[PDB]
Design a protein around this nucleic acid. Sequence first.
DNA 1: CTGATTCAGCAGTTGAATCAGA
DNA 2: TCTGATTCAACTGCTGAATCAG
Lengths: 334, 385, 391, 154
Amino acid sequence: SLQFTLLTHLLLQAPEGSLCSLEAKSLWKTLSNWIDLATSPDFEVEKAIFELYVSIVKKFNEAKTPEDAQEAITHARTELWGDSPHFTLKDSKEISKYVEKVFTADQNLLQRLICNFQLTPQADLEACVRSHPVSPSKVSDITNYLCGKVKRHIDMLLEAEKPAVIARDDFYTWYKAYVQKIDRQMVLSSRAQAPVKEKAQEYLPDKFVQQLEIIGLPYEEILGAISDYLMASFDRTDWAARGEVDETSFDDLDTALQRTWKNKQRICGLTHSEKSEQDQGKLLYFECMQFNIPLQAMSPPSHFIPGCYHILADSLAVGWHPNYTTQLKNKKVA
Amino acid sequence: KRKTEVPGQALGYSLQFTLLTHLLLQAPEGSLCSLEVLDDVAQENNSGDIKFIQSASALTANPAADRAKSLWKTLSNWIDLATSPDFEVEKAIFELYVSRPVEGSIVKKFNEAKTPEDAQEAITHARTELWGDSPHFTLKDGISKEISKYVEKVFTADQNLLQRLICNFQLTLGSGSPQADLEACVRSHPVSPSKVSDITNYLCGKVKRHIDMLLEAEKPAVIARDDFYTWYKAYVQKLSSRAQAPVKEKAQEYLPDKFVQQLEIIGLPYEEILGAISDYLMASFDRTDWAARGEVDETSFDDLDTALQRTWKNKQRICGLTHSEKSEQDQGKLLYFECMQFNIPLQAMSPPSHFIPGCYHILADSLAVGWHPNYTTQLKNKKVA
Amino acid sequence: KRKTEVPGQALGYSLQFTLLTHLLLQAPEGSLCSLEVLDDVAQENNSGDIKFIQSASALTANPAADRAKSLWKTLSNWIDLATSPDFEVEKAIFELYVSRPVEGSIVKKFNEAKTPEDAQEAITHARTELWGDSPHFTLKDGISKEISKYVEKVFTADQNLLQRLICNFQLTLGSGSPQADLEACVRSHPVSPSKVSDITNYLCGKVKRHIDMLLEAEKPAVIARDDFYTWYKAYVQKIDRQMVLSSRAQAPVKEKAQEYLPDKFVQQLEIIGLPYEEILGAISDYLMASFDRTDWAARGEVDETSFDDLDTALQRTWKNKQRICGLTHSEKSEQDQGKLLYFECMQFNIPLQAMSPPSHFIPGCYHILADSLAVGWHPNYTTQLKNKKVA
Amino acid sequence: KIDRQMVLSSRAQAPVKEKAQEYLPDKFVQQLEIIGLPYEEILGAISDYLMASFDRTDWAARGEVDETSFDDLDTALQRTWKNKQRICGLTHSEKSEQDQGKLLYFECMQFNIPLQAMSPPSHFIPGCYHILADSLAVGWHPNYTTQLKNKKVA
DNA sequence: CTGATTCAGCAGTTGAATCAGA
DNA sequence: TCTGATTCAACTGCTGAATCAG
């Protein structure tokens, strides 16, 4: 988790370069794959900037210079391989293989690599995102999205036996594009989660479920309706809580939805009077579930309008059957 | 040109505003950035730090040279500032911003010095190069009159004070254009690279005008970076397809796909499957192009797919119930075309005239959605035959 | 305030950029507005006329005083410039901008001396006050050392050149804040009052940025007026947009509703037998839509031509919907067809000036069209109205 | 007063009355009447043709609309034409071909679509609609070409 | 042949003290 | 008594020219 979070942080604090960050065998193996990946033809070590967030490592940090990098690598080989002519300190093989790959590799490439070998988790990442020109309310959403996307991109490379490298210019084409959706107001982001199956049945005795069962919808339709109910209610709470929406906008949306009900129910009833009343209710339900109107000229989630209809139904403000007022009373006795 | 005009000298004062904006963009949270109040440009943070910046617009000179009026006057001025009895230098980060990337024998020693012992050797080299050897000071009389007073004030001042001043000294060179390093700072933020100029033009317009209006009233010229970022966010908060029509030969290769299996499940004049496959290809390229170059988020594509799927489901129920007095052949094309007349916008942006049908086709290639009353059952029926 | 900081004089240079922006906003098409090329600010138009400027940011001192150093230095510099060969002094309209309203007898007479004889009188007044009566010049020895050379050069120069220079000399002086005197110029443009504070500080920023990028390359700083207005219009198209119309109408009381019952649209509604509550809702929608139309036309939110386009669109949609309604549901009573028509246009929406109207504005406008008999819900609504007006 | 437009506010006047009879032999007309369409709204659509063409020329000359805008607008409008054509051909097949044609015309004329994210006048859509009808790009009658060929001989 | 010295002459107007006018 | 002009001293801005070191 932290590897995927500080990787995001480092990706934010990096000018136009390739990037990487991993978590002694552990210390040497990661830089072994780093030197192998650098020796790949496409990589440019100069633009690369690595990280090994947690004396030889301190020197690796302290270099920042090809001559100082050479001095640090000299200290390293003197410490780990003993005397140069004999190499008596060669005698653990597992790490020793990586040391053989590293110390015998290109001197120029490794010398440039050691310069970029910087060393070093959620609060500072959030603060760094907050320092950018984005609304302070959206910072948590952007941080979560970025961490998720970085984890997804690293995992797909790891499963394909490819070096774990993220380009900063490939990170900002995600983050700048996300900002356009979420920072600029034109789109609403739902933080609501789909309810689990068990908690859904707790809303079965509710009045909108009774309405839909009066209309005789399939058992999956009512479950989807309950999910829309809970998610839209959560969205109603959260949007007003963080100031992303106004109460008068909710009032206007409910007014427009009620007006839509008024037209649609009458049109369906007198146009499909020959059809049975239950089919008329199903037609009304599915016709007004097609309605989608922007909320503050701001596109809502695809489930939000159905959930608004469900909350209006729970308060009997909307109904599907032509005489659902009598139907609810009749069913409440049985 | 005549000598009565001073453009290059006017840049020395315009760089004040430019560097004030550039400092405001990178200012730590809760900082007050001031112009010609504490120094040429200054930044004060909540922790009590101050960052005096003697911006120099080097264009046909070298202010960071070994023997220059600018560098030694700046160092003497900072020593005068630090001589005040109400100013500690442990948080007094200095700066000698130069428009060009310039190097000097002494300024480099001052810039790379970070520790007091290193700074002591830096001042030792400075004295050896300018005043001369320590006991004799042979070159003292050779030092120019303009530089003499300032170098005397620098060297004769308190040794630990000058040591810490040199430690905190920093040389921040530009790149030949201080106005293209500001735009580089702006384009490194979450803004559209096509709009980077539009922000950068506006930000300085605030940073100048406000500061101007704050000096025209004979008041200190301080921008709170919270106010700057308020303007910045308020400004920031306030689709095109590149998929050419595929060749006809490329169209026939998609025939074995389940997408074409469905289009003709309920049949449909093959004069169709060509347009349908075309829309498939344009939408498939558009999704990847917008995801890669960056105009629409991928979560936006997922939400668009969910919206089209729910619309297909509700339209399927509506079409079946209303036109149940028809053969499945009719209800299939009735669901089809009605689904193809759905005009949701992609993340509040209106997509091109083909994007929604193409994305419907992309979703229909999967098992999720199909334009037939019983497409699931016939999927295997056609596959067996 | 330390001596090492000079905020008051840095404004003397910032005012040059501000005056360049204002000059560009006032410049005619086909001109080039330069900064420290020909003078502190300058404007060279298509016809070759050159307009110089000597911006003088005055906060405390008076640069337009009779014995002010700045005024006489500026006049000496301009007489030196006029002395230069191949110079067309007629076009060289000079100016001494001052950031505050300043006064002075010599400078005022110079400013107001359009006629060459008026210029002769003004220069005579200045010479009498600074040198004394000719030819003794008893006061000549007492003038300031700093002012001495400039006084000499101005007074002893060629008579005709000084006369013309003073003729086209001006004292264009703004209010205490030229920045606030510039935002007013943008306000005078046909620009939304909410967006003036954004257009002004985008134009100033772009001008400063372009000038800086020209002068870092050692090139002469000059912004073309054509380029400036191209950027101006391109930004205006970007930023000058309003999105949502907020209705300020209020739902009427129940008592007021029955006052409109004898109206024609109510007759049309009750012809197809709408219930009473729906009729009352229709009266409310009518009232809100009428008030919204009047208010939006009054305060400039929506142009009257936009309302004309909206009305034409509603009529077109109503006829196109009535024609299809009369054939898709022909197997019903005319009252049912009327209810279908009225409700289908009730559900319809359309944006006004590409802006979403409130949920009641379109229904109320449809009721307005019904009242004027432009539209109708009953298939034979005119015949039904004629029959009911007799019963 | 002191308003702002930045929208396609097409400047046009009332069309000449004689041009209504002058454009009667035009191909889009004998596309129209063959679905039993009355003459009065035939004249209305003729006038809509006249002002729409004048506004198209005005935008092409002065310059406010990019060339690709007309092309992709007409492409989308033709796709919608065909979609509603099939819709009325199937869901309204249980009646005369004449009434199918007229209902298709009615249900197609209600369509609206912005140009360059800005709203055109109400008369523009029928104008481009009949412009497409001029070059066989769209058709109201289900078998419009056959009846056009039949009437061209009579 | 670039870069550094040395000095120089434009610009920016304010700050501090003195005197002229209501 | 105070607003204002007057004479001067004075911080900042950095380019231009002739000369000189490597």
